[PDB]
Amino acid sequence: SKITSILNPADITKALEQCAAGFHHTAFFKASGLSKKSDAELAEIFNVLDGDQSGYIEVEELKNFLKCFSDGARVLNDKETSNFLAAGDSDGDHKIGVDEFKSMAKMT
Ligand SMILES: [Ca+2]
Ligand SMILES: [Ca+2]
């Protein structure tokens, strides 16, 4: 998909392995290559993470973030999910919008 076209599978594997002892978004975004992608590439990624095309990554989607990169990956636990949301959700609506996703990828 766009994921495996935009990102290198080997980088995805690194980022997934890094999750074994706990998910940290900055480490994941670095390993995966997300923090090197352009504005426009990040919007494309956002659209495929937004499974229901709501315009947002809701918390229920965010729990399944790793599965967007590999379907067999684990779910995030509640601590992981809440910290990730907290990092991204600057406008206070408890979901991640396209602008917030770009900002989280490049400026954290
Ligand atoms: Ca959504
Ligand atoms: Ca938000």
Side-chain angles (χ1 to χ4, degrees):
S1 78
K2 285 194 180 182
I3 289 292
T4 50
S5 75
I6 293 164
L7 301 178
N8 192 293
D11 291 344
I12 290 169
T13 296
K14 170 155 45 167
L16 290 173
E17 291 308 288
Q18 278 181 359
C19 289
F23 173 83
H24 304 277
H25 79 280
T26 67
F28 184 95
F29 277 64
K30 174 184 183 167
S32 65
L34 285 170
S35 63
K36 289 189 315 197
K37 298 300 98 167
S38 61
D39 198 85
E41 285 177 306
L42 288 170
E44 285 184 287
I45 290 281
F46 175 86
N47 292 323
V48 304
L49 300 176
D50 183 16
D52 68 344
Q53 297 289 113
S54 64
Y56 311 94
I57 306 165
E58 293 81 24
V59 288
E60 200 67 41
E61 290 173 333
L62 207 64
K63 178 177 192 60
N64 294 297
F65 178 75
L66 301 185
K67 291 176 164 295
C68 297
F69 299 86
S70 184
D71 59 3
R74 65 177 178 93
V75 303
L76 296 184
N77 66 36
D78 294 343
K79 190 183 181 184
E80 283 164 343
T81 301
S82 169
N83 287 342
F84 189 12
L85 179 63
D89 180 35
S90 57
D91 65 16
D93 66 347
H94 322 294
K95 46 192 184 183
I96 296 176
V98 61
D99 303 320
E100 291 171 325
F101 181 74
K102 297 168 177 189
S103 301
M104 175 168 40
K106 300 300 282 274
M107 308 173 181
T108 67

